[PDB]
Amino acid sequence: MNPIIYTTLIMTVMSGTMLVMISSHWLLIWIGFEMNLLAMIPVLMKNFNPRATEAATKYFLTQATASMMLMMAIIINLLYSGQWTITKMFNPVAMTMMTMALAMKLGLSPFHFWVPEVTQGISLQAGLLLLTWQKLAPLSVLCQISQSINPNLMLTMAMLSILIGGWGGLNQTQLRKIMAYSSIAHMGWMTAVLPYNTTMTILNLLIYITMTLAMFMLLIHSSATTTLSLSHTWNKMPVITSLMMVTLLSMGGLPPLSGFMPKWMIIQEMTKNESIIMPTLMAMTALLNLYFYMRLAYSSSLTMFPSTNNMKMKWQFEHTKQMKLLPTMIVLSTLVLPMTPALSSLN
Amino acid sequence: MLKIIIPTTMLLPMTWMSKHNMIWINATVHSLLISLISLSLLNQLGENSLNFSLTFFSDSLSAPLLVLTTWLLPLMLMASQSHLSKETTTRKKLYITMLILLQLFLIMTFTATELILFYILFEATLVPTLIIITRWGNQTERLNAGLYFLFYTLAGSLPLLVALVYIQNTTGSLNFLIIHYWSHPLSNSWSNIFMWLACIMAFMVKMPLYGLHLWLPKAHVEAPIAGSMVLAAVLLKLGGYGMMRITTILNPLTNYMAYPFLMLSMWGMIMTSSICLRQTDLKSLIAYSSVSHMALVIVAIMIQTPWSFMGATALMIAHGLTSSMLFCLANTNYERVHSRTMILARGLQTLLPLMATWWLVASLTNLALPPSINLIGELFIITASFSWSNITIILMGMNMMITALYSLYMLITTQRGKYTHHINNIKPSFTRENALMALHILPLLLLTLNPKMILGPLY
Amino acid sequence: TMMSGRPGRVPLQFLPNEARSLPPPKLTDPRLVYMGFLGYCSGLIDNAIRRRPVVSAGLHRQLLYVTSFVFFGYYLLKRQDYMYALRDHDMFAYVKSHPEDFPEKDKKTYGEILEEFHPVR
Amino acid sequence: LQYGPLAFVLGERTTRKLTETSKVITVDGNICSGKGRLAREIAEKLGLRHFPEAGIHYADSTTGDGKPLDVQLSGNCSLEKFYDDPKSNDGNSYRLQSWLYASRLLQYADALEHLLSTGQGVVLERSIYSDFVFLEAMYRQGFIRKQCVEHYNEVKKVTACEYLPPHVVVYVDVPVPEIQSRIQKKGNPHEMKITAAYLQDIENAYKKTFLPEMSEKCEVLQYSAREAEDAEKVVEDIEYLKCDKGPWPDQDDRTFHRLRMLVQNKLEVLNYTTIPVYLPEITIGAHQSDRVFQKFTELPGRKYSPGYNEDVGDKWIWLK
Amino acid sequence: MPLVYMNIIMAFAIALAGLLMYRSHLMSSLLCLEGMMLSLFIMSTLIILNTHFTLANMMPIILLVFAACEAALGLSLLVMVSNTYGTDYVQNLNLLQC
Amino acid sequence: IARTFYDGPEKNYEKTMAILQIEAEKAELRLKELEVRRLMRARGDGPWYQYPTIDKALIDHSPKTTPDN
Amino acid sequence: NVLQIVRDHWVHILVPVGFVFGCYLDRRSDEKLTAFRNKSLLFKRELRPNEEVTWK
Amino acid sequence: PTIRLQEDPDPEDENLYEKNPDSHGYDKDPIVDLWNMRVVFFFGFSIVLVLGSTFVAYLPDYRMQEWARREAERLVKYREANGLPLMESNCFDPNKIQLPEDED
Amino acid sequence: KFYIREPPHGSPDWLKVGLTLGTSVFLWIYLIKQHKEDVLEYKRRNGLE
Ligand SMILES: CCCCCCCCCCCCCCCCCC(=O)OC[C@H](COP(=O)([O-])OCC(O)COP(=O)([O-])OC[C@@H](COC(=O)CCCCCCCCCCCCCCCCC)OC(=O)CCCCCCCCCCCCCCCCC)OC(=O)CCCCCCCCCCCCCCCCC
Ligand SMILES: CCCCCCCCCCCCCCCCC[C@@H](O)O[C@H](CO[C@H](O)CCCCCCCCCCCCCCC)COP(=O)(O)OCC[N+](C)(C)C
Ligand SMILES: CCCCCCCCCCCCCCCCC[C@@H](O)O[C@H](CO[C@H](O)CCCCCCCCCCCCCCC)COP(=O)(O)OCC[N+](C)(C)C
Ligand SMILES: CCCCCCCCCCCCCCCCC[C@@H](O)O[C@H](CO[C@H](O)CCCCCCCCCCCCCCC)COP(=O)(O)OCC[N+](C)(C)C
Ligand SMILES: CCCCCCCCCCCCCCCCC[C@@H](O)O[C@H](CO[C@H](O)CCCCCCCCCCCCCCC)COP(=O)(O)OCC[N+](C)(C)C
Ligand SMILES: CCCCCCCC/C=C\CCCCCCCC(=O)O[C@H](COC(=O)CCCCCCC/C=C/CCCCCCCC)COP(=O)(O)OCCN
Ligand SMILES: Nc1ncnc2c1ncn2[C@@H]1O[C@H](COP(=O)(O)OP(=O)(O)O)[C@@H](O)[C@H]1O
């Protein structure tokens, strides 16, 4: 596919997200979602194969149903109050429809089924885009209307997302499905604090995006999509595997790494309200995510797996194209906790 | 106190820029200098702490622990530099980096003046230890040992974080001084019951309490010798430090919430002590003895009397030194015969006499021979327990007899009898090993010369 | 939520005018030194990933890394300080304007207050 | 500017440098055929670039200094041991076959990169499309197992599908008694142990499978031993061909851009050679892997990137 | 709420249920999506006509435009599915199960 | 030893007093901030939790072809 | 002789320099907690005619 | 191949006493080995152990144990001189304490 | 040596080096001048100096 067309499609996806972000009219936010989906469908299909076609079809169907529910909620809100502005959302039925539509767009449980399959069916670049940039617009809309969030519904979906992500990741051998399930669990953590503090949501989103970008660029540097193909990397790029292990530990939420900062803050926030049981359950459930991160670390960095003879040839060649911002993203993904108070510059 | 913290962060680049054949020399020399510097914290006041800054402080409970940590790092280096001879320079520097990071995290942990920072460093200690165990362990059980260690710790430690943020929101501060001065009684409520459990269970697991102790044999047996030393000597005492710091806010609920744990600590004391009588693996025997001693310390903290606290501090220090020495002694035989079975190499007193006397002195210290600090701590705890209830003496005396039984049993099995006939690769003891044993054991006796330095703030 | 809608707030300013009435962070601020350390670590990781001598491969690019991190960190610290100052200002003004919600209670000495005693035994 | 999307968006197109004489040519034949000399003559007459047949140490010639490395560090297989003990239990036969296939894949990528960057044509002494004749020869003679054949077919399926077959396929047909006589007259003691059944299997694989398969997508010009010496006749036969049946006439600028992005980045080329299939012949344990990799890193110019090795005379490092 | 509004909302609910249930064909699901578009258009038009929102009258038109886009997208995808299998059966789209 | 390596007790005493004052002030400030946040979120009369309302500058005050608007 | 041994053993000054820096930093830190210097009820004393601070 | 890997055989232990009969067990190189022994012995036994123990044994009484003894001696002498009970069961003066007026 | 020309030239890319050093010095000078400006402005506003 032509580089100019690829640039135009990426710019259209980004412009749709920005249009959702900068709009005060419900119709314009809907149009931004439509433009985003329209330009995103071919990017998932850049490398043509039946699996990519499957993933594109499933993504399209899910997002189209979500768009229908979004527009229906907007129209019901207009009927019960002649307001087009994105605000408190005076109607509760329309509010439930909107919350469900945005949850389906994000992939929150029980609307999570499409994320692992779409992630596994596309390339690592499309997976990076899907799991990082596609989460901005629905979260922005949810942040703007948090005053009318039904805490029961949103918190139920968030706890379900954390549980389902943790459990589903345990069974996975492919790396893209592992990333998808980690994404679902992190989305649950992000939306759990939404009715209480959107600043914590934005902080968790930024930390998650940094960690996910680091993980995906590491997986692209070492062209590995399975556990066993990543088991070979130590024999060619030991430094890459060490950095990957530290990044995985950070995503597991262990201090003093960066991945500890969001959940920590989130817990504190819910403890400023009463909300004692939920943060405890979320921590004990994030234990599962840490478990399968540690399993990946055992396979890739803390043990040396058997290799093949042809690997010797690869010892003689360097990387033709180097991904910029990878060192910066690794550093921001690991050694950033001491700068925790700077989150005050987020509200 | 940055005069101790900064030199370790300088140990880091000095190690990473030293040439290939002088990493061990530089690390040992400067670690010993840092321990000499940290020795200045033993000049403690009599009424309050040493409040260096808004973030760091020291009292007479954390000063001996800091000295123990700084002293243990050079011993770990000397014991490690033998089995890593065939390792590449980069991974040797990585191992030394792991040890240095562990010591730095422990140094900040023992002196953090507020509970959230203490929690952050107390959990940060997990990463270097896990990496050490699961990367430089020898057998294939090191992966499961690391998993058990990590998840046992985190399962008990996450509710502690929830309870800590709850306490900070309710009271307004988590600084130890403000927490102690503004302390209020805890009412008998279900909410208070679960707050007590959340505050206590992390340190219970770190001791470990009997019942939650199944991670310790795996972790201490599968680890390399430096990992075993740091686990037994220092990392087990984080639970005791946290317990004796956080119990100031749990009164008077403790008076009736300690009843289960006390039982688990008392009867468990017997059970683990009996396991050592039938252990076919030396490292597992040492690990189970550590479990029983820590159970005694848990009793001391739970009954919450000044004599009990002094005994707990003395026992923590004494057990750290003794268990480190025992692990090193067992490792010498392991490097000789490449097997951990106790009955494999027998009658070693004939072939290694000086190592035999090291074994004897370590075993004598382990079974609390007077006037060692081991006996001082155990006896103070026993007297406090007798004041608590006169029926405890039965369990304590049973434990004393079983401890002597298994200590001398291990000594007789390894050192006495006749040598195994086919084992002919037992070379004379090196200067490094004998120096390591002497550097373990001389501080113990020098400390029983002046015991008030390890008796805690209640002295 | 709490601070997004505040009267007299320019949308995308990142540094309001009133922020200049606050002391600027010193150039030796430990947070700035930590940002410089983060830049140094990024430079070293960049050297290691491209298979170059880690300490001494590219000094110019390492200097650019450190200076970029310090540069961004200075304004980040300024904005963080300003937002905390705003929080304190608003809280104090709210306390001052609603006296009945924050009344100064009577001062009692420990000689008058009766605390229950719980013996340890 | 190194070639990439930016060099394609502005300017560089590869169809403006194809001048109808590109004609990627591979010469083929049995063992001890005059295909090497014929390939050299064709290359110098048509003005193309000749690629000597890829051996064990081909990749060493294109990296660092062109000098070959130790067999323990590159290859880990020898052809002499295959001729001596083809049925050895250390797996030398299939290890050699797979290393040779990877070398041929790398050489094909290099030839395609040169063709697409300069437009000048190339001549090859064999290709990845004909390497299977030796594999079939080993399998029929019992040298390798069926699992090795399956692994070879998997790697070939995931690798060779991404490239364009050669325009012209040249075959030199020398019968088995003649090549046996040439081997006897050669003087290499190890080649003297090649049984006639092995060469017969090679010839059967060539004639029954390779030529019919390449007929439907390439121009096949068979020859005989006598016709090979007069290479001017072969060159004028090539000059009057109609390259109309393959996939080359259907190549646009976008497909060529994708192929040119693929042929560089040799790591991407070799990606699927080391798939995690654990055949005992080619699987290497963790300890041996670590030892040999550490030994490789210790080589004089191999520790750092090709511009940052001080010990081979690279200066101004701190300013790069 | 008048009864016509109730009928339009019921039509939308029926179309949504029809989409969320798949029988075999993808074309039928695309038809259900188009029906949801049609019901949304009628609902918006009725609301904008009853309350004389003059500037909102272009809003349904824009809606229709993006409707086509979705339709176009779906149709494109359907072609590819057919080209891989010869039928538009959703049961063939099961590769990502493993 | 005391002269070379250590200081008097007054230094540590008064440093402890200053530290205690700072931490007590911080605790009282945290509790006050929590109470203020609760009140502001409950009432909406403060500078915080000011959710947007429609700008009144958008309204058109002109004759509307019909006297009754 | 000085150049080679210096380039070999310059790493032996990192820890002493670190300790000196830590001492200086501790002095800087405890010079910020003087809000009660010579103001305590137990240690309030009259300054000598030549000195200016009870402790540094 | 009747095997599973191309794996190196397990090497046998290298006895340090073989090449260096007086080896100290620190390193293979005799010079670095001897100097490692020397630095360990000097900085462990000579500097830290003995000098540190001497420093600990002469630490100034910041714990105020002789001060408390002198204070107790003065108090006891004073209270015996005037026929006082030598210690009161009330730690604080009851006059400065305001009990609740009634518990009935 | 190296059979290939080692794309990264054995001599440094003086254009890239110059531009990198130049932006480093420019950023440092700008930061120093900005810090001076905020110090002066803060002192002026609060009546200090
Ligand atoms: C809190 C206090 C401070 C601590 C902060 C945190 C730690 C420090 C910052 C961390 C980041 C810094 C650098 C990162 C990149 C470096 C990577 C690397 O490989 O380095 C190689 C390099 C040596 O290699 P080389 O010389 O190029 O040639 C050898 C070949 O490269 C040979 O290359 P190779 O290919 O053969 O190497 C293969 C090897 C290579 O594998 C690695 O090297 C591991 C890479 C580390 C991962 C870093 C990720 C991000 C950092 C996170 C740290 C987390 C800390 C929190 C605690 C949790 C711990 C995980 O992989 C393996 O063999 C497998 C081993 C598996 C073990 C698994 C453990 C790995 C994770 C450990 C992370 C812990 C931090 C390590 C810090 C130091 C490491 C160099 O190391 C260095 O030289 C750099 C050291 C630091 C330089 C400082 C010097 C400055 C001047 C000194 C004087 C100071 C001031 C003077 C003024 C005073 C007045 C006089
Ligand atoms: C492997 C080892 C791990 C460590 C084990 C730790 C053990 C933790 C147990 C802590 C003991 C105290 C918990 C409950 C406190 C009271 C005990 C109970 O009997 O309550 C009685 C009440 O009667 C009933 O028992 C009530 C509780 C009934 C439900 C609890 C049964 C749970 C079964 C044990 C599970 C095993 C623990 C491990 C879980 C994974 C007391 O009567 P009452 O004076 O009116 O209430 C006093 C408390 N108030 C005032 C706050 C109300
Ligand atoms: C791991 C670290 C991840 C950080 C992510 C990348 C770090 C670099 C960030 C890039 C900085 C440039 C962004 C903006 C600069 C100019 C634009 C300016 O106008 O933005 C204004 C203010 O700038 C941004 O809002 C703040 C960006 C600051 C990001 C740093 C905080 C990171 C979290 C703490 C972790 C510690 C990291 C330490 C440094 C690495 C927006 O005002 P406002 O219209 O009202 O916001 C609307 C949305 N709100 C109200 C809901 C927030
Ligand atoms: C007359 C004496 C007879 C008996 C001698 C007894 C032996 C005692 C000596 C043992 C010393 C133990 C080390 C403890 C050092 C304390 C460090 C720290 O606490 O003190 C610093 C004091 O600085 C000192 O100068 C520390 C110097 C000690 C350095 C020890 C290095 C010894 C290592 C020797 C190894 C040999 C090297 C050669 C290699 C072959 C604090 O600095 P500062 O906060 O500002 O000052 C506050 C106090 N003031 C204000 C009153 C001055
Ligand atoms: C191989 C040959 C064996 C046989 C030959 C033996 C040779 C002769 C030995 C026999 C003599 C026995 C010694 C008799 C006791 C005399 C020493 C005593 O006076 O010193 C003690 C003092 O001992 C020291 O306090 C011991 C120091 C404690 C250990 C220092 C730590 C070293 C660093 C190692 C790290 C350890 C980490 C563990 C946590 C701390 C008394 O304490 P104290 O009455 O008050 O001080 C007296 C001075 N005053 C009056 C001014 C106060
Ligand atoms: C190696 C395994 C170790 C396992 C240890 C994990 C269990 C530790 C004990 C339970 C910890 C949960 C405590 C939650 C945090 C405490 C905070 C708190 O106490 O606040 C209370 C809140 O108290 C709670 O809500 C506690 C709810 C507990 C739910 C989590 C269940 C976890 C399992 C419970 C049974 C097991 C506990 C002991 C098991 C020991 C391990 C064998 C007051 O809040 P308010 O709502 O404002 O009430 C006052 C105003 N009305
Ligand atoms: N895939 C292969 N498997 C086994 N041997 C091979 C393979 N490819 C080439 N060889 C060996 O390489 C040797 C030299 O190749 P060849 O071209 O036939 O000789 P020459 O260069 O003299 O013409 C031959 O003995 C041939 O057997």
UniProtKB/TrEMBL annotation, chain B:
<keyword id="KW-0830">Ubiquinone</keyword>
<feature type="domain" description="NADH:quinone oxidoreductase/Mrp antiporter transmembrane">
    <location>
        <begin position="112"/>
        <end position="401"/>
    </location>
</feature>
<dbReference type="Pfam" id="PF00361">
    <property type="entry name" value="Proton_antipo_M"/>
</dbReference>
<feature type="transmembrane region" description="Helical">
    <location>
        <begin position="21"/>
        <end position="41"/>
    </location>
</feature>
<dbReference type="GO" id="GO:0031966">
    <property type="term" value="C:mitochondrial membrane"/>
</dbReference>
<dbReference type="InterPro" id="IPR000260">
    <property type="entry name" value="NADH4_N"/>
</dbReference>
<feature type="transmembrane region" description="Helical">
    <location>
        <begin position="223"/>
        <end position="244"/>
    </location>
</feature>
<feature type="transmembrane region" description="Helical">
    <location>
        <begin position="309"/>
        <end position="330"/>
    </location>
</feature>
<feature type="transmembrane region" description="Helical">
    <location>
        <begin position="389"/>
        <end position="412"/>
    </location>
</feature>
<feature type="transmembrane region" description="Helical">
    <location>
        <begin position="116"/>
        <end position="133"/>
    </location>
</feature>
<keyword id="KW-0472">Membrane</keyword>
<keyword id="KW-1278">Translocase</keyword>
TrEMBL record, chain C:
<dbReference type="InterPro" id="IPR009423">
    <property type="entry name" value="NDUC2"/>
</dbReference>
<dbReference type="GO" id="GO:0045271">
    <property type="term" value="C:respiratory chain complex I"/>
</dbReference>
<keyword id="KW-0496">Mitochondrion</keyword>
<keyword id="KW-0812">Transmembrane</keyword>
<keyword id="KW-0679">Respiratory chain</keyword>
<comment type="similarity">
    <text>Belongs to the complex I NDUFC2 subunit family.</text>
</comment>
<dbReference type="GO" id="GO:0006120">
    <property type="term" value="P:mitochondrial electron transport, NADH to ubiquinone"/>
</dbReference>
<dbReference type="Pfam" id="PF06374">
    <property type="entry name" value="NDUF_C2"/>
</dbReference>
<feature type="transmembrane region" description="Helical">
    <location>
        <begin position="61"/>
        <end position="77"/>
    </location>
</feature>
<keyword id="KW-1133">Transmembrane helix</keyword>
<comment type="function">
    <text>Accessory subunit of the mitochondrial membrane respiratory chain NADH dehydrogenase (Complex I), that is believed not to be involved in catalysis. Complex I functions in the transfer of electrons from NADH to the respiratory chain. The immediate electron acceptor for the enzyme is believed to be ubiquinone.</text>
</comment>
<protein>
    <recommendedName>
        <fullName>NADH dehydrogenase [ubiquinone] 1 subunit C2</fullName>
    </recommendedName>
</protein>
From TrEMBL, chain D:
<feature type="binding site">
    <location>
        <position position="30"/>
    </location>
    <ligand>
        <name>Mg(2+) 1</name>
    </ligand>
</feature>
<feature type="binding site">
    <location>
        <position position="34"/>
    </location>
    <ligand>
        <name>GTP 3</name>
    </ligand>
</feature>
<feature type="binding site">
    <location>
        <position position="83"/>
    </location>
    <ligand>
        <name>GTP 1</name>
    </ligand>
</feature>
<feature type="binding site">
    <location>
        <position position="134"/>
    </location>
    <ligand>
        <name>GTP 1</name>
    </ligand>
</feature>
<feature type="binding site">
    <location>
        <position position="35"/>
    </location>
    <ligand>
        <name>GTP 4</name>
    </ligand>
</feature>
<feature type="binding site">
    <location>
        <position position="36"/>
    </location>
    <ligand>
        <name>GTP 3</name>
    </ligand>
</feature>
<keyword id="KW-0274">FAD</keyword>
<keyword id="KW-0285">Flavoprotein</keyword>
<keyword id="KW-0547">Nucleotide-binding</keyword>
<feature type="binding site">
    <location>
        <position position="134"/>
    </location>
    <ligand>
        <name>ADP</name>
    </ligand>
</feature>
<feature type="binding site">
    <location>
        <position position="186"/>
    </location>
    <ligand>
        <name>GTP 4</name>
    </ligand>
</feature>
<feature type="binding site">
    <location>
        <position position="131"/>
    </location>
    <ligand>
        <name>GTP 3</name>
    </ligand>
</feature>
TrEMBL record, chain G:
<keyword id="KW-0472">Membrane</keyword>
<dbReference type="InterPro" id="IPR012575">
    <property type="entry name" value="NDUB1"/>
</dbReference>
<dbReference type="GO" id="GO:0016607">
    <property type="term" value="C:nuclear speck"/>
</dbReference>
<comment type="similarity">
    <text>Belongs to the complex I NDUFB1 subunit family.</text>
</comment>
<keyword id="KW-0249">Electron transport</keyword>
<dbReference type="Pfam" id="PF08040">
    <property type="entry name" value="NADH_oxidored"/>
</dbReference>
<dbReference type="GO" id="GO:0045271">
    <property type="term" value="C:respiratory chain complex I"/>
</dbReference>
<keyword id="KW-0999">Mitochondrion inner membrane</keyword>
<keyword id="KW-0812">Transmembrane</keyword>
<keyword id="KW-0679">Respiratory chain</keyword>
<keyword id="KW-1133">Transmembrane helix</keyword>
<comment type="subunit">
    <text>Complex I is composed of 45 different subunits.</text>
</comment>
